[PDB]
Design an enzyme around this catalytic site. Structure first.
Site, PDB file in Angstrom:
ATOM      1  N   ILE A  15       0.834  -1.191   0.000  1.00 16.50           N
ATOM      2  CA  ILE A  15       0.000   0.000   0.000  1.00 16.50           C
ATOM      3  C   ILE A  15       0.874   1.248   0.000  1.00 16.50           C
ATOM      4  CG2 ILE A  15      -1.783   1.337   1.243  1.00 16.50           C
ATOM      5  CD1 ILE A  15      -2.393  -1.231   2.851  1.00 16.50           C
ATOM      6  N   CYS A  16       0.632   2.146  -0.950  1.00 10.37           N
ATOM      7  CA  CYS A  16       1.301   3.445  -0.952  1.00 10.37           C
ATOM      8  C   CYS A  16       0.434   4.441  -0.187  1.00 10.37           C
ATOM      9  CB  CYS A  16       1.559   3.922  -2.386  1.00 10.37           C
ATOM     10  SG  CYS A  16       2.556   5.442  -2.513  1.00 10.37           S
TER      11      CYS A  16
END
Ligand SMILES: O=C([O-])C(=O)[O-]
Ligand SMILES: [Zn+2]
Ligand SMILES: [Zn+2]
Lengths: 111, 146
Positions: B83-84
């Protein structure tokens, strides 16, 4: 007298004869807790290149680390984890959902 | 870390963020499973998404490692479930909690950040053809998370 709120670093409140501090931005921490937070901030800043700041509101913080470290660490009983009957029922339902996703090739397996 | 982890666990049991749950994997207090019900303002609506949470030794002073286990089509989440998200790296603070992280991820599902993508083709489609994007996101939700 003694603060009525919670220390956001450890998640405990304040008790008789405990050592605590109050910042210029009106936030209360146990002395021991704030000392630990400051140590980590100092390490990160150095590795990038002051910028030590309140964990709650990000206001740049003035402090003396040695004075904070000298205070007694609060003796705080660990809060037992005893899942309620309802929580145990909920966990069983989640197990069933996970199993179906596996069968669909919907679970990422990094191996 | 352990006393802090027990405090959070009890708070998340009393009063978890809407549509979410979190608790230990077996006996190991440092490894949790979380669930997010797909937000009603997202193409993930109706799905249930599993995530993994690993706490570092120096928690809460360093961030938890959080990843999706359930496959998901999103410009900011890749095929490894990475996840960014800013608060999981540059913007972490010990004042933050797992409850707050889960709330942030729910928000990201409703509104991606296409200009900082992990998946360039999905970002291209999101920007040029949102109809196509939402269609594909729903299709993956239906196949994998429902
Ligand atoms: O990813 C796929 O194969 C799909 O959603 O059909
Ligand atoms: Zn404290
Ligand atoms: Zn403050």
């Amino acid at each position: 007298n003694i603060p009525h709120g919670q220390c956001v670093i450890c998640l405990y409140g304040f008790q008789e004869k405990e050592a605590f501090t109050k910042t210029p931005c009106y936030h209360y921490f146990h002395c021991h807790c704030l000392a630990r937070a400051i140590q980590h901030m100092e390490q990160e800043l150095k590795a990038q290149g002051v910028g030590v700041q309140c964990p709650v509101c990000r206001e740049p913080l003035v402090y003396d680390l040695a004075s904070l470290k000298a205070a007694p660490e609060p003796q705080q009983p660990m809060e037992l984890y005893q899942p309620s009957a309802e929580s145990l029922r909920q966990q069983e339902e989640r197990k069933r959902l996970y199993q179906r996703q596996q069968e669909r090739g919907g679970i990422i397996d990094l191996e | 870390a352990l006393k802090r982890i027990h405090k959070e666990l009890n708070d998340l049991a009393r009063d978890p963020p809407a549509q979410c749950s979190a608790g230990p994997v077996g006996d190991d207090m440092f490894h949790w499973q979380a669930t997010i019900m797909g937000p009603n303002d997202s193409p993930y609506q109706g799905g249930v998404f599993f995530l993994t949470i690993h706490f570092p030794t120096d928690y809460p002073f360093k961030p938890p490692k959080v990843a999706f286990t359930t496959r998901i089509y999103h410009p900011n989440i890749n095929s490894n479930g990475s996840i960014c998200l800013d608060i999981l790296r540059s913007q972490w603070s010990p004042a933050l909690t797992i409850s707050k992280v889960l709330l942030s991820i729910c928000s990201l599902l409703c509104d991606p950040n296409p200009d900082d993508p992990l998946v360039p083709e999905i970002a291209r489609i999101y920007k040029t053809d949102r109809e196509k994007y939402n269609r594909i996101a729903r299709e993956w939700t239906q196949k994998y998370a429902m």
